[PDB]
Amino acid sequence: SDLGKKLLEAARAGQDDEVRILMANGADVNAEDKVGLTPLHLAAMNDHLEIVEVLLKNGADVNAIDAIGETPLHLVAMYGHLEIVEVLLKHGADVNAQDKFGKTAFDISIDNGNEDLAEILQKL
């Protein structure tokens, strides 16, 4: 309840140790806020790699979607955090997931003309 909200904020804000202790305390790796974002979404979108890593290690849901169908991958695609992009795919992120406007991570790489990201997306 409160642990869940506390974890969401910590992941969002990048408090590595908060994340760690909260989960040990019993916070749900997969809590969602009102608009459907998880700690994995929040931590990834904000470029917090260690946290992402730790969340996945604790069984965070790589293909969690928020209220408009966005996965963590959608978000890191939009922000261009390539190294987080890789960690997600390494955990079975679904490169094909469609958000609500039927956009995939690759569609985002095209829209924002990020050639590097499309490079790695395409490859996979």
Next chain:
Amino acid sequence: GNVVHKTGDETIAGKKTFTGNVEVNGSLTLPTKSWSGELGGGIILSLRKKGTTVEYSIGGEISSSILANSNLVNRSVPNEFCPRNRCSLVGHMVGGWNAFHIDIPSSGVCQWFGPTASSGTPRGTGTYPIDHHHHHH
């Protein structure tokens, strides 16, 4: 008696139309009105109105999840600042190349048109008119 002279502090009622050119070498003072609040998600809008033009400044700090293309519903812009057609205020986030825009519509329920976001520092200073009719969809 009730004429305007080339000296003296004076008050002048009536609709006066100057067909020629007018210069003001001192200050020109019109009524103003200011307002400031958190639109939502930690984003602050500060407004100052002068005539039909509004000077705005985006401020604050994203502190909660804002969905892509979402309405900001913590606070609306009061009607007296609301434009007749939607005004898209282009802002920028600190520390990167990321740009966004906030629509303020006639209803004053502002709408965030950036992508989904949960952190960062939005900024942007400019103006928007109150009564510029967009004229044709």
Next chain:
Amino acid sequence: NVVHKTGDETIAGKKTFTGNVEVNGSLTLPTKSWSGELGGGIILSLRKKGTTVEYSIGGEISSSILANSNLVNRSVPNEFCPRNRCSLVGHMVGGWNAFHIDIPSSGVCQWFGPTASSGTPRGTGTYPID
């Protein structure tokens, strides 16, 4: 030919106020509106107020548009054209993309985002006539 302290009147000649002026009601300057599709589906709405032009970018990219390309569907009419190139900043709905449209003295606007063939471009602001 005497301006009175009351009454609606029309004043010709050039009046120069050397002190301070205060206008309680409203102060109206000459206004004029134009609006049109610059090309690519991009729409520009302009209103001239005095020596300021208020603009709003709208519409939707419905064709290909090359980087640095001229927008040739419509030119901004002369009375709305500025002395120098004016760069109007805009943003595309839904993501972090910004672009800019130049308005030269010519009125033939120019796109300065990358080559683009989709998107909803928006932005409101002003540029000077001189």
Next chain:
Amino acid sequence: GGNVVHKTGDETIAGKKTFTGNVEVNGSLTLPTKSWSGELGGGIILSLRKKGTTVEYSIGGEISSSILANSNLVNRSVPNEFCPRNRCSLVGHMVGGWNAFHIDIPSSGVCQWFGPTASSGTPRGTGTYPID
């Protein structure tokens, strides 16, 4: 009518005039103006023109060296009469891509770059900010 304002002819008018009604100016309305233009730093040029309590700005130049993210532009500072009361954030865009940045001009006139570290490109953007 030596000290009377007529509705014909060029006249100079002293004294604080308070217009309680509504004033329509069909010709032009000129307020005090001043222009400045300079290189803030890193190749970036800012051109200003103040009219009354508004500054018209225009960002130009071409980036010509390393500009650290969030760094002060310390080639030239903006003269006091163009400086705002509060920080104003001038949003701008880099030619040929999607990238945006903003430059804050503070009370001190020491403008400040809020893009990432960058070392090339054409920065642009036209707008106004208030002086009051």
